[PDB]
Amino acid sequence: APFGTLLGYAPGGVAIYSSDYSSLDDAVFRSYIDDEYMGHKWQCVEFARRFLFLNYGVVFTDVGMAWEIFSLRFLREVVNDNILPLQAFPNGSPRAPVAGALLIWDKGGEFKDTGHVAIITQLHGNKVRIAEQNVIHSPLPQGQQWTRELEMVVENGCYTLKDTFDDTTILGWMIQTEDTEYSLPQPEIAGELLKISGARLENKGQFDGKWLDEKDPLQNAYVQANGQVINQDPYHYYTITESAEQELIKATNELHLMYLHATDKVLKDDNLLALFDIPKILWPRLRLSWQRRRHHMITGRMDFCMDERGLKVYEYNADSASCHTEAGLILERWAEQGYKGNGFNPAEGLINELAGAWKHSRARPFVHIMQDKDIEENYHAQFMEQALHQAGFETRILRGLDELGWDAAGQLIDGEGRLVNCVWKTWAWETAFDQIREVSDREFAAVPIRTGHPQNEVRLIDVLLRPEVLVFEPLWTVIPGNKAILPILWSLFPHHRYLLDTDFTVNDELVKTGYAVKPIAGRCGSNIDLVSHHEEVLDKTSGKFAEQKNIYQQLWCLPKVDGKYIQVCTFTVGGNYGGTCLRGDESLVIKKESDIEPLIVVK
Amino acid sequence: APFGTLLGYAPGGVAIYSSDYSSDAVFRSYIDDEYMGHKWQCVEFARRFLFLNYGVVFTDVGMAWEIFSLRFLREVVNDNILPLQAFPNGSPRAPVAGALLIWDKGGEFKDTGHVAIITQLHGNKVRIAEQNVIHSPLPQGQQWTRELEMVVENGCYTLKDTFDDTTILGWMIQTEDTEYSLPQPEIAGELLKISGARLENKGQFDGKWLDEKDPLQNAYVQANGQVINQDPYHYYTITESAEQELIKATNELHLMYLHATDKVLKDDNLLALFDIPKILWPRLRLSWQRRRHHMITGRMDFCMDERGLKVYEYNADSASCHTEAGLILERWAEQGYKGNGFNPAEGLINELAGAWKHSRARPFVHIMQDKDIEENYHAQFMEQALHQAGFETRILRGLDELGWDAAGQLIDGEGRLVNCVWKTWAWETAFDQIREVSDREFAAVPIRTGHPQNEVRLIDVLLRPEVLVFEPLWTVIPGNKAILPILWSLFPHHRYLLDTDFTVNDELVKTGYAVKPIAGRCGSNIDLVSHHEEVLDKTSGKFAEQKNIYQQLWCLPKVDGKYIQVCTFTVGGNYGGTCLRGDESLVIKKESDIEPLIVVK
Numbered sequence A: 001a002p003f004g005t006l007l008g009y010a011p012g013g014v015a016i017y018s019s020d021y022s023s024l025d026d027a028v029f030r031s032y033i034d035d036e037y038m039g040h041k042w043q044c045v046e047f048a049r050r051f052l053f054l055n056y057g058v059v060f061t062d063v064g065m066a067w068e069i070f071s072l073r074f075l076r077e078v079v080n081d082n083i084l085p086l087q088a089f090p091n092g093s094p095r096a097p098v099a100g101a102l103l104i105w106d107k108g109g110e111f112k113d114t115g116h117v118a119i120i121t122q123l124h125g126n127k128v129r130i131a132e133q134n135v136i137h138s139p140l141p142q143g144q145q146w147t148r149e150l151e152m153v154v155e156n157g158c159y160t161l162k163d164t165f166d167d168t169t170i171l172g173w174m175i176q177t178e179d180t181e182y183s184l185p186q187p188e189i190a191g192e193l194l195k196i197s198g199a200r201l202e203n204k205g206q207f208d209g210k211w212l213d214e215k216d217p218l219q220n221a222y223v224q225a226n227g228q229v230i231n232q233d234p235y236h237y238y239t240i241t242e243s244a245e246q247e248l249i250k251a252t253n254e255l256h257l258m259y260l261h262a263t264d265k266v267l268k269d270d271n272l273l274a275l276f277d278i279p280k281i282l283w284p285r286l287r288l289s290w291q292r293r294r295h296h297m298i299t300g301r302m303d304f305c306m307d308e309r310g311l312k313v314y315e316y317n318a319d320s321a322s323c324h325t326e327a328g329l330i331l332e333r334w335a336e337q338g339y340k341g342n343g344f345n346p347a348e349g350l351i352n353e354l355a356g357a358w359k360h361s362r363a364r365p366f367v368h369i370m371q372d373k374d375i376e377e378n379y380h381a382q383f384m385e386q387a388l389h390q391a392g393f394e395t396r397i398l399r400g401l402d403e404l405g406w407d408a409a410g411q412l413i414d415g416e417g418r419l420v421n422c423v424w425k426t427w428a429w430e431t432a433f434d435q436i437r438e439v440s441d442r443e444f445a446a447v448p449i450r451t452g453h454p455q456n457e458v459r460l461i462d463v464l465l466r467p468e469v470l471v472f473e474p475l476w477t478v479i480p481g482n483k484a485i486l487p488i489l490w491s492l493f494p495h496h497r498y499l500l501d502t503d504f505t506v507n508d509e510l511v512k513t514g515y516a517v518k519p520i521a522g523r524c525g526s527n528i529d530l531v532s533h534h535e536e537v538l539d540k541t542s543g544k545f546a547e548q549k550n551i552y553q554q555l556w557c558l559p560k561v562d563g564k565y566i567q568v569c570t571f572t573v574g575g576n577y578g579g580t581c582l583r584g585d586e587s588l589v590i591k592k593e594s595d596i597e598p599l600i601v602v603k
Numbered sequence B: 001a002p003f004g005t006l007l008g009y010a011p012g013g014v015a016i017y018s019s020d021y022s023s024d025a026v027f028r029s030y031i032d033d034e035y036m037g038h039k040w041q042c043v044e045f046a047r048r049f050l051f052l053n054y055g056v057v058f059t060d061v062g063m064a065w066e067i068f069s070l071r072f073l074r075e076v077v078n079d080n081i082l083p084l085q086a087f088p089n090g091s092p093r094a095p096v097a098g099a100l101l102i103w104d105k106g107g108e109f110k111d112t113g114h115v116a117i118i119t120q121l122h123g124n125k126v127r128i129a130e131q132n133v134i135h136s137p138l139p140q141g142q143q144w145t146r147e148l149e150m151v152v153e154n155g156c157y158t159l160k161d162t163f164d165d166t167t168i169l170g171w172m173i174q175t176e177d178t179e180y181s182l183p184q185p186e187i188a189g190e191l192l193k194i195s196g197a198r199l200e201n202k203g204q205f206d207g208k209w210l211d212e213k214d215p216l217q218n219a220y221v222q223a224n225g226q227v228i229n230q231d232p233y234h235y236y237t238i239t240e241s242a243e244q245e246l247i248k249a250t251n252e253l254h255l256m257y258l259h260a261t262d263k264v265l266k267d268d269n270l271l272a273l274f275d276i277p278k279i280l281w282p283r284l285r286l287s288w289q290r291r292r293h294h295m296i297t298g299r300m301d302f303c304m305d306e307r308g309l310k311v312y313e314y315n316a317d318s319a320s321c322h323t324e325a326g327l328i329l330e331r332w333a334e335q336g337y338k339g340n341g342f343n344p345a346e347g348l349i350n351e352l353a354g355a356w357k358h359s360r361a362r363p364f365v366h367i368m369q370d371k372d373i374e375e376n377y378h379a380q381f382m383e384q385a386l387h388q389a390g391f392e393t394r395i396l397r398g399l400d401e402l403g404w405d406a407a408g409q410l411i412d413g414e415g416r417l418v419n420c421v422w423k424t425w426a427w428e429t430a431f432d433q434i435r436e437v438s439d440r441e442f443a444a445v446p447i448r449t450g451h452p453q454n455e456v457r458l459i460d461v462l463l464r465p466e467v468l469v470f471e472p473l474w475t476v477i478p479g480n481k482a483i484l485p486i487l488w489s490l491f492p493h494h495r496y497l498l499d500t501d502f503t504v505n506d507e508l509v510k511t512g513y514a515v516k517p518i519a520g521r522c523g524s525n526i527d528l529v530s531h532h533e534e535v536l537d538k539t540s541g542k543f544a545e546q547k548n549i550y551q552q553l554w555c556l557p558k559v560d561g562k563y564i565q566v567c568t569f570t571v572g573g574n575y576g577g578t579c580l581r582g583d584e585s586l587v588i589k590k591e592s593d594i595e596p597l598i599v600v601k
């Protein structure tokens, strides 16, 4: 049948649609049940996630290809943002495949690159029935709630399934259970595949003059702030394998889920929330934000240490992150200007990824962009306006707060008298929180915002905390963006392969490993102390956050490659991977001024 | 200024509007799905202020003065219940910023009373914000409407109003600290006695007093004849104070019940006590999360007399009696009552229309009833409310008319797609169809999406993922008696709760108790046992094999020859009327009569 024709249903009344597109017949492809994303119409993964969500209220994280599901080790229980264990069993297992189980195909043969996923609906003595999308594209017999049956051989308590295809490879099945018996250990990637490698373009003088296009306003805003410069030596770049990017993608999606799970735990317990030093008057507002804008985050940036020892996350800049322009535009132009290879810039789709996120946000039609008066934020703010524009929103850029004012009744208006009720900001929420802390000893029954002023002087907090102004990033993002969340994540996922032991005191293990001291609300590599296991100060930075509470994180130094310490960063857009970029510095501490290093992912 | 004009803001950006009506669904004020109040009354501003600044809310109330009697606030994000204390004007407990300030009815605030929010406390005064006093723009950036003089003598705080004929009750603080606070008012028993009365017999009910021209009234007659009770010239009355109490209890108990529901759905150990097929558990949860605010109507059963008010159960899934209370008794009154009282259920049909208007029902609603003439008028009465709220409907009687197309889509007798249903069926009937199979290890609710002879079962409709069903699946939890011991556990000794347990514990042995199947209804399989350990009564029924709960004995009062039970309706979570049920026996049943009731001030 044509694309999206209803073919029948799997157990429980879960539809099965034809996913046959033809050359003869982009946001419309996103399949959602409420605010929960099921996948892409009407692929194998979309059916499997929807089946699991409609029948058991659970879902698995975003994956590029179906075969990757087999590498996952948990499922998110949607109604309470809970995390359940998911075990994997290889085909030919003592662990029989029960109804409800995920059945995964590695890539290969009939499922060439994608691999495949289906749901086991019923087990028999010598076969199982399964349901799936993207195999059967014709209507199923009336009332039949399975698409295919696969023969199952049961020898000596071992179970083996055989496909109806002759060139495919069945990885195995998956069960949501705490019972690890017979299960496969979580796949671990070979260190060597994570090594970052230096490389060099041929010098044909490609970066001699004005290589950035000064006709493009965005690029020129970038030059006004930085010159025709990305890194020290533009002829030099670094590369990472595709296996490595795949690993980056996987960790980004998983850690985003871990962080929102620890955010939920935080907001559910005053003792945990207290650890963040956020003004108590905001607490109920933080809870309400989390409840109603749960799915409204547009973008954030994770900072990682990646090399042969593995993948580790230092932090998640979820409130207000930048580098998007550098990764998604300047490096594109850099590649266009001088890269002649087969590889690619892992951040190439960032602008479109952002546009999609905005299309599916609940942002108002007109969005005011609030940036500070720093030429450096100009391009960041304009790069985002480009995504907003592409998604169909109207915008106006506010530089500083001077243009903002109030009518007689106190409504917030811009320099043109237009009402400001939706803003995307470059300002960190914490900056506004400082305005409440300044008058901490006053007895306000509410966030002390102004609804009027003789001189019409509008402060940041007078915009961001007006109840009817719809702000992005949402207020709750200050929680995953606050390093006080690291000890909590370590407590929730002790010894997780991507986490570093982090604590509020230098505990015993940190003593022996050496640690990094970081302010909980700092950024840009400010006020950071790196202390060795030999108890010597390896490095230290200055900055405005010296008075804040600090956390202590197990020392795990950036690798040094081709003379520079290299840090890997990934972007999240709507909660999922949206790209990777590199920061390189002569020291162990990346900072606001550290270079962005051209990165090419090679297959 | 004209109605709804912004006059400014109270602290934190909570707008204050003009409520000058001088200058019907449009008056409801909501923030998302949370109902704030009526535009733009004192109560609406107080509730919106507390919700926007602290994410908490207080229960619906008829007039502002009643807030002073409340002792809890609901925390919206986790449906948690926080303690709220009351302090009398002239208290050692100072009125802090954020506190609710309540006026009793009287003077400037004649019937309503009033409520404001205290924004700032000084040494000789307090500043407050409110909505139904000042209707003119406020001084630019001023986030308070009036200032009241505060007198402070010997550790005691006293506020004086700007009006000379008003009575300030006090202020309320969300705190566990009970020192200085007021005990929760309790009504005088005498005001709760139900009294009998008689109309003068001038033959008002001799013949056809019900209008058979009205299809609804005729559906009622086809099922019951021109009859309501054994003697139509007799009636009962309750005081307006008793009604205010029933209102208060209905709203509180509905929130307590939803609170226990949230707790149940958060803990498998509690959920398991309900004997609901495990396969539905994930669905119950999704339903509770997505259809939180979608319950249309329910009915609580109470014992009310000089000893006070006790709730037996809350028929939150499939409740009836709406036609009797809201139409037939109205006709009864119009036909034979000439007094000053009123039918407390008179506005039921309008209350339901509103609930529907703000539900998220789809454009076309299929009404599903069973083939029982008794259900015809209930279905039809509800259809009228749906019609009034602008919805298209079709009544399906039994399952015969339903079918499936070739792909397995559910359709009605005219090929129309069925995707929104209001049912008279109890969810339990459907759960039975799941229990019947129970052998196989199905991976999902075992619904059919096709059948050779096209035979559609109740579950094949209600548990179809894309059919939007009212009442929502989650209501089976407050409607299942296994929630009574949980309610007792959560609010131990609450004034309206009866000690309920899953075994006859020691305290129940001493009090006597009622044995009640957890998923029964209509008075079936009930056993009443006295403290003397004697069976005071037993009923038969189709539920003898279910788990039972044991509830502290508290027998209905007998007035004028019959045990009288008081019921109240909830519509959209709030009080929507009262009616009476009378029986020669201690156990009310489906056939027990509905007794005319008049509320008198």
Ligand SMILES: Nc1ncnc2c1ncn2[C@@H]1O[C@H](COP(=O)(O)OP(=O)(O)O)[C@@H](O)[C@H]1O
Binding pocket: A303, A314, A315, A500, A515, A516, A518, A522, A523, A524, A525, A526, A528, A530, A553, A554, A555, A556, A557, A558, A567, A588, A589, A590, A591
């Ligand atoms: N545990 C750690 N071990 C080694 N270096 C660290 C560690 N944590 C942070 N760093 C270094 O410090 C920089 C700043 O820490 P980060 O967590 O990214 O905070 P921010 O960038 O917000 O200031 C990192 O980019 C990295 O170079």
Ligand SMILES: Nc1ncnc2c1ncn2[C@@H]1O[C@H](COP(=O)(O)OP(=O)(O)O)[C@@H](O)[C@H]1O
Binding pocket: B301, B312, B313, B498, B513, B514, B516, B520, B521, B522, B523, B524, B526, B528, B551, B552, B553, B554, B555, B556, B565, B586, B587, B588, B589
């Ligand atoms: N604890 C109790 N003490 C005395 N009578 C009770 C008690 N519980 C129930 N009854 C009587 O039994 C009837 C049926 O119980 P109820 O809880 O309303 O269950 P249902 O109506 O669902 O069968 C009540 O209307 C009342 O007449």
Ligand SMILES: [Mg+2]
Binding pocket: A303, A315, A524, A525
């Ligand atoms: Mg960083």
Ligand SMILES: [Mg+2]
Binding pocket: A315, A316, A317, A522, A523, A524
């Ligand atoms: Mg940071």
Ligand SMILES: [Mg+2]
Binding pocket: B301, B313, B522, B523
């Ligand atoms: Mg009852």
Ligand SMILES: [Mg+2]
Binding pocket: B313, B314, B315, B520, B521, B522
């Ligand atoms: Mg009942």
